[PDB]
Protein backbone atom coordinates (compact mmCIF):
# COMPACT_ATOMS: atom_id res chain seq x y z
CA UNK A 1 0.00 0.00 0.00
CA UNK A 2 1.00 3.56 -0.63
CA UNK A 3 -0.39 6.70 -0.12
CA UNK A 4 -2.38 9.06 -3.19
CA UNK A 5 -1.46 12.16 -1.91
CA UNK A 6 -2.64 15.40 -4.34
CA UNK A 7 -2.29 18.72 -4.27
CA UNK A 8 -5.35 20.59 -3.23
CA UNK A 9 -4.60 24.14 -1.95
CA UNK A 10 -1.26 26.29 -1.85
CA UNK A 11 -1.27 29.33 0.60
CA UNK A 12 0.36 32.19 0.34
CA UNK A 13 0.59 35.08 2.33
CA UNK A 14 3.99 35.05 4.84
CA UNK A 15 6.15 37.98 3.32
CA UNK A 16 9.68 35.33 4.40
CA UNK A 17 10.31 31.84 4.43
CA UNK A 18 7.75 30.03 6.57
CA UNK A 19 9.31 28.50 9.47
CA UNK A 20 6.83 26.02 11.05
CA UNK A 21 3.44 24.44 10.43
CA UNK A 22 1.02 22.72 12.57
CA UNK A 23 -2.76 21.47 13.03
CA UNK A 24 -4.46 22.38 15.69
CA UNK A 25 -5.39 19.36 17.64
CA UNK A 26 -9.49 20.15 17.06
CA UNK A 27 -8.67 19.48 13.05
CA UNK A 28 -10.26 22.85 12.34
CA UNK A 29 -7.04 25.34 11.86
CA UNK A 30 -3.40 25.12 9.95
CA UNK A 31 -0.88 27.61 12.15
CA UNK A 32 2.47 29.00 10.33
CA UNK A 33 5.26 31.41 11.99
CA UNK A 34 7.57 32.35 9.39
CA UNK A 35 10.77 34.72 9.22
CA UNK A 36 8.65 37.54 8.76
CA UNK A 37 7.78 38.21 12.48
CA UNK A 38 4.14 36.74 12.18
CA UNK A 39 2.04 34.03 12.96
CA UNK A 40 -1.05 33.09 10.41
CA UNK A 41 -4.01 31.10 10.86
CA UNK A 42 -5.82 28.99 7.80
CA UNK A 43 -8.95 26.89 7.25
CA UNK A 44 -6.94 23.49 7.64
CA UNK A 45 -10.01 21.67 4.97
CA UNK A 46 -10.17 24.85 2.43
CA UNK A 47 -7.14 26.79 3.37
CA UNK A 48 -8.73 29.50 3.52
CA UNK A 49 -7.03 32.91 5.39
CA UNK A 50 -8.37 33.25 8.81
CA UNK A 51 -6.20 35.94 10.23
CA UNK A 52 -2.60 37.46 11.40
CA UNK A 53 -1.04 37.03 14.51
CA UNK A 54 1.88 39.60 15.17
CA UNK A 55 4.04 40.97 18.26
CA UNK A 56 7.01 38.98 18.04
CA UNK A 57 9.88 41.95 17.20
CA UNK A 58 12.29 39.03 15.18
CA UNK A 59 11.57 36.24 12.90
CA UNK A 60 9.92 32.98 14.42
CA UNK A 61 11.32 29.60 14.22
CA UNK A 62 8.40 27.44 15.46
CA UNK A 63 5.03 27.62 16.71
CA UNK A 64 2.60 25.59 18.74
CA UNK A 65 -0.72 24.56 19.58
CA UNK A 66 -2.33 23.84 23.00
CA UNK A 67 -4.16 20.27 23.62
CA UNK A 68 -7.94 22.61 23.69
CA UNK A 69 -6.42 24.39 19.84
CA UNK A 70 -7.58 28.00 21.91
CA UNK A 71 -3.64 28.76 22.29
CA UNK A 72 -0.57 28.66 20.70
CA UNK A 73 3.14 29.20 21.57
CA UNK A 74 6.24 30.76 19.38
CA UNK A 75 10.09 30.83 19.43
CA UNK A 76 11.62 33.64 17.52
CA UNK A 77 14.98 35.39 17.38
CA UNK A 78 13.70 37.97 20.16
CA UNK A 79 14.61 35.87 22.56
CA UNK A 80 11.36 35.43 23.46
CA UNK A 81 8.32 33.05 23.52
CA UNK A 82 4.71 34.14 23.09
CA UNK A 83 1.01 32.72 24.55
CA UNK A 84 -1.75 33.82 21.79
CA UNK A 85 -5.17 33.46 22.96
CA UNK A 86 -5.92 32.62 19.48
CA UNK A 87 -9.80 33.54 19.26
CA UNK A 88 -8.73 37.49 20.40
CA UNK A 89 -5.32 37.31 18.73
CA UNK A 90 -4.20 38.42 22.21
CA UNK A 91 -0.14 37.93 23.55
CA UNK A 92 -1.03 36.39 26.75
CA UNK A 93 2.49 36.56 28.05
CA UNK A 94 5.49 37.20 26.85
CA UNK A 95 8.05 34.70 27.86
CA UNK A 96 11.57 35.81 28.61
CA UNK A 97 14.93 34.47 30.14
CA UNK A 98 16.09 33.04 27.26
CA UNK A 99 19.91 34.19 26.49
CA UNK A 100 19.40 33.39 22.59
CA UNK A 101 17.40 32.78 20.06
CA UNK A 102 14.24 30.39 20.88
CA UNK A 103 14.52 28.10 17.95
CA UNK A 104 11.87 25.47 19.09
CA UNK A 105 8.33 25.00 21.48
CA UNK A 106 5.74 22.72 22.74
CA UNK A 107 3.03 22.74 24.82
CA UNK A 108 2.93 19.61 27.34
CA UNK A 109 -0.90 17.66 27.25
CA UNK A 110 -2.14 19.35 29.44
CA UNK A 111 -1.29 22.80 28.25
CA UNK A 112 -0.22 24.12 31.40
CA UNK A 113 3.49 23.89 30.54
CA UNK A 114 5.74 25.03 27.68
CA UNK A 115 9.10 23.51 26.40
CA UNK A 116 11.15 25.72 24.73
CA UNK A 117 14.59 25.24 23.25
CA UNK A 118 17.23 27.67 22.62
CA UNK A 119 20.29 28.85 20.73
CA UNK A 120 21.42 29.61 24.51
CA UNK A 121 21.87 25.52 24.80
CA UNK A 122 18.65 25.23 26.99
CA UNK A 123 15.97 23.74 27.28
CA UNK A 124 13.47 25.81 29.45
CA UNK A 125 9.92 24.58 31.49
CA UNK A 126 7.89 27.76 31.18
CA UNK A 127 4.40 27.49 33.49
CA UNK A 128 1.23 28.52 31.14
CA UNK A 129 -0.76 30.38 33.63
CA UNK A 130 1.73 33.08 35.00
CA UNK A 131 4.32 33.15 31.97
CA UNK A 132 7.12 32.09 34.29
CA UNK A 133 10.57 29.85 33.67
CA UNK A 134 10.00 27.46 36.30
CA UNK A 135 13.01 25.55 35.02
CA UNK A 136 16.15 26.34 33.36
CA UNK A 137 17.56 22.89 31.93
CA UNK A 138 21.46 22.73 30.90
CA UNK A 139 20.38 20.38 28.24
CA UNK A 140 23.24 20.44 25.71
CA UNK A 141 26.88 22.08 24.56
CA UNK A 142 25.21 23.64 21.31
CA UNK A 143 21.51 24.85 20.01
CA UNK A 144 18.47 23.29 20.82
CA UNK A 145 16.76 22.34 17.63
CA UNK A 146 13.55 20.48 19.23
CA UNK A 147 11.67 20.06 22.32
CA UNK A 148 8.78 17.74 22.83
CA UNK A 149 6.57 15.83 25.26
CA UNK A 150 5.47 12.76 25.46
CA UNK A 151 2.23 11.63 25.63
CA UNK A 152 1.59 11.92 29.87
CA UNK A 153 4.23 14.80 29.78
CA UNK A 154 6.11 13.63 32.28
CA UNK A 155 9.30 13.22 30.31
CA UNK A 156 10.77 15.98 27.76
CA UNK A 157 12.88 14.91 24.34
CA UNK A 158 15.43 17.33 23.46
CA UNK A 159 17.83 17.53 20.44
CA UNK A 160 21.08 19.74 19.45
CA UNK A 161 23.68 20.57 17.24
CA UNK A 162 25.86 18.90 19.90
CA UNK A 163 25.02 15.13 18.38
CA UNK A 164 22.85 14.16 21.11
CA UNK A 165 19.21 13.55 22.18
CA UNK A 166 17.85 13.78 25.46
CA UNK A 167 15.39 12.27 27.70
CA UNK A 168 14.37 14.45 30.76
CA UNK A 169 12.19 14.14 34.02
CA UNK A 170 9.80 17.18 33.73
CA UNK A 171 9.15 17.24 37.25
CA UNK A 172 12.86 16.84 38.73
CA UNK A 173 14.26 18.09 35.46
CA UNK A 174 17.14 14.86 35.48
CA UNK A 175 18.64 13.45 32.15
CA UNK A 176 16.80 10.43 32.31
CA UNK A 177 18.70 9.26 28.58
CA UNK A 178 21.41 10.41 26.35
CA UNK A 179 20.66 8.60 23.08
CA UNK A 180 23.43 9.20 20.15
CA UNK A 181 24.43 6.75 17.64
CA UNK A 182 28.27 5.87 15.91
CA UNK A 183 28.65 9.11 13.99
CA UNK A 184 27.89 12.13 16.09
CA UNK A 185 25.51 14.28 13.32
CA UNK A 186 24.10 17.12 14.43
CA UNK A 187 20.66 16.23 15.64
CA UNK A 188 18.04 18.85 13.82
CA UNK A 189 14.84 17.31 15.25
CA UNK A 190 13.28 14.96 17.63
CA UNK A 191 9.84 13.73 18.71
CA UNK A 192 7.83 11.18 20.87
CA UNK A 193 5.92 8.66 18.95
CA UNK A 194 2.44 9.17 19.55
CA UNK A 195 2.26 6.37 21.81
CA UNK A 196 5.49 7.59 23.01
CA UNK A 197 7.30 4.00 23.14
CA UNK A 198 9.11 5.87 20.41
CA UNK A 199 11.20 8.93 19.44
CA UNK A 200 11.54 9.62 15.86
CA UNK A 201 15.12 12.00 15.34
CA UNK A 202 16.17 13.78 12.66
CA UNK A 203 20.10 13.79 11.69
CA UNK A 204 21.82 16.06 9.26
CA UNK A 205 22.91 13.31 7.38
CA UNK A 206 20.11 12.77 5.53
CA UNK A 207 18.87 10.30 7.82
CA UNK A 208 16.18 9.90 9.88
CA UNK A 209 16.02 7.34 12.62
CA UNK A 210 13.38 5.38 15.11
CA UNK A 211 14.36 4.66 18.68
CA UNK A 212 12.91 2.42 21.14
CA UNK A 213 14.60 5.37 23.89
CA UNK A 214 14.15 3.31 26.99
CA UNK A 215 15.83 0.29 25.35
CA UNK A 216 18.52 3.30 23.82
CA UNK A 217 17.85 1.04 20.50
CA UNK A 218 17.26 2.46 16.59
CA UNK A 219 15.29 0.46 15.14
CA UNK A 220 13.67 2.12 12.41
CA UNK A 221 15.83 4.34 9.46
CA UNK A 222 14.40 6.22 6.64
CA UNK A 223 16.40 7.79 4.15
CA UNK A 224 16.23 9.05 0.42
CA UNK A 225 15.56 12.01 1.56
CA UNK A 226 17.87 15.23 1.70
CA UNK A 227 18.84 16.74 5.10
CA UNK A 228 22.06 18.27 5.60
CA UNK A 229 21.46 21.68 6.63
CA UNK A 230 18.51 23.15 7.79
CA UNK A 231 16.07 21.50 11.05
CA UNK A 232 13.31 20.33 9.33
CA UNK A 233 10.49 18.92 10.89
CA UNK A 234 8.70 15.33 10.30
CA UNK A 235 6.06 13.24 11.26
CA UNK A 236 4.18 10.45 12.02
CA UNK A 237 1.01 10.14 10.12
CA UNK A 238 -1.50 7.45 11.40
CA UNK A 239 -4.67 8.71 9.64
CA UNK A 240 -4.17 6.26 6.95
CA UNK A 241 -1.36 4.24 6.45
CA UNK A 242 1.15 4.41 8.74
CA UNK A 243 4.07 6.73 7.57
CA UNK A 244 6.80 8.67 7.84
CA UNK A 245 6.25 12.10 6.73
CA UNK A 246 9.32 15.02 5.96
CA UNK A 247 10.03 17.57 4.16
CA UNK A 248 13.18 18.06 1.93
CA UNK A 249 16.43 20.29 0.82
CA UNK A 250 15.39 19.05 -2.46
CA UNK A 251 12.44 20.66 -2.41
CA UNK A 252 10.63 17.56 -1.97
CA UNK A 253 7.81 16.08 0.74
CA UNK A 254 9.21 12.41 1.85
CA UNK A 255 6.88 9.68 2.80
CA UNK A 256 7.93 6.53 4.25
CA UNK A 257 6.03 3.27 5.25
CA UNK A 258 6.74 3.36 8.90
CA UNK A 259 7.72 -0.41 9.36
CA UNK A 260 8.98 -1.42 6.06
CA UNK A 261 11.29 1.97 5.58
CA UNK A 262 10.34 2.68 1.94
CA UNK A 263 9.43 5.11 0.49
CA UNK A 264 5.74 5.16 -0.81
CA UNK A 265 5.56 8.96 -2.37
CA UNK A 266 6.87 11.99 -3.04
CA UNK A 267 5.30 15.15 -2.93
CA UNK A 268 6.47 17.66 -6.28
CA UNK A 269 5.55 21.13 -6.12
CA UNK A 270 7.56 23.32 -3.97
CA UNK A 271 10.51 25.61 -5.28
CA UNK A 272 12.65 25.96 -2.03
CA UNK A 273 13.68 23.23 0.71
CA UNK A 274 10.26 22.24 2.47
CA UNK A 275 11.72 23.37 6.13
CA UNK A 276 8.31 21.92 7.54
CA UNK A 277 5.33 19.88 7.12
CA UNK A 278 2.80 18.40 9.28
CA UNK A 279 0.12 15.38 9.28
CA UNK A 280 -3.39 16.47 10.11
CA UNK A 281 -5.29 14.59 13.30
CA UNK A 282 -8.33 13.07 11.53
CA UNK A 283 -7.88 13.28 8.15
CA UNK A 284 -5.53 12.19 5.39
CA UNK A 285 -4.17 15.86 4.82
CA UNK A 286 -0.21 17.05 4.81
CA UNK A 287 0.61 20.49 5.38
CA UNK A 288 4.01 21.66 4.07
CA UNK A 289 5.80 24.77 3.65
CA UNK A 290 9.15 26.18 2.35
CA UNK A 291 12.09 28.31 2.49
CA UNK A 292 12.94 32.24 1.02
CA UNK A 293 12.58 31.97 -2.80
CA UNK A 294 9.15 29.54 -2.15
CA UNK A 295 7.34 31.48 1.15
CA UNK A 296 4.19 29.06 0.45
CA UNK A 297 2.44 26.51 2.23
CA UNK A 298 0.69 23.50 0.60
CA UNK A 299 -2.54 21.30 1.50
CA UNK A 300 -2.12 17.96 0.53
CA UNK A 301 -4.87 15.28 0.28
CA UNK A 302 -4.74 11.52 0.03
Given at each position: VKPNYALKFTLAGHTKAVSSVKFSPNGEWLASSSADKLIKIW?????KFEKTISGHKLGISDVAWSSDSNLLVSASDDKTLKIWDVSSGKCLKTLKGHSNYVFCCNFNPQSNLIVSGSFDESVRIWDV??????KTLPAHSDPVSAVHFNRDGSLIVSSSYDGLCRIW????????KTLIDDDNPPVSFVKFSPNGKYILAATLDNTLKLWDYSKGKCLKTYTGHKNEKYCIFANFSVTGGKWIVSGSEDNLVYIW???????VQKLQ???????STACHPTENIIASAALENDKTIKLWKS
Open positions: GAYDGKTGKCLDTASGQCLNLQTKEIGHTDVVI
